[PDB]
Design a protein around this nucleic acid. Structure first.
Length: 64
DNA sequence: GCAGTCAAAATC
DNA sequence: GATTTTGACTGC
């Protein structure tokens, strides 16, 4: 794709990126657009991580 | 200089 | 069309 991995995304969860103004944002998988989360790193990241838990509700596939 | 959203490019 | 992460843009 255009951007696979970045330095800021190294500390961010999936569906969450940081802008140039130090503001984080959550991208929706329905359209790819997003909204401002928070200017804190552990805050915006923690928020996107929770949503990822629900988004990951489906994963168990007969693991061993 | 913050606050909040959509486009850019490249892939499958 | 989907995705994935960064860039640009507007308003005060």
């Amino acid at each position: 794709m255009g951007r696979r991995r970045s330095h800021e995304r190294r500390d961010l969860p999936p569906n969450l990126y940081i802008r140039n103004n130090g503001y984080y944002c959550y991208r929706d998988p329905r359209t790819g657009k997003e909204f401002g989360l928070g200017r804190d790193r552990r805050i915006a990241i923690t928020e996107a991580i929770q949503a990822n838990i629900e988004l990951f509700s489906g994963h168990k596939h007969k693991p061993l």
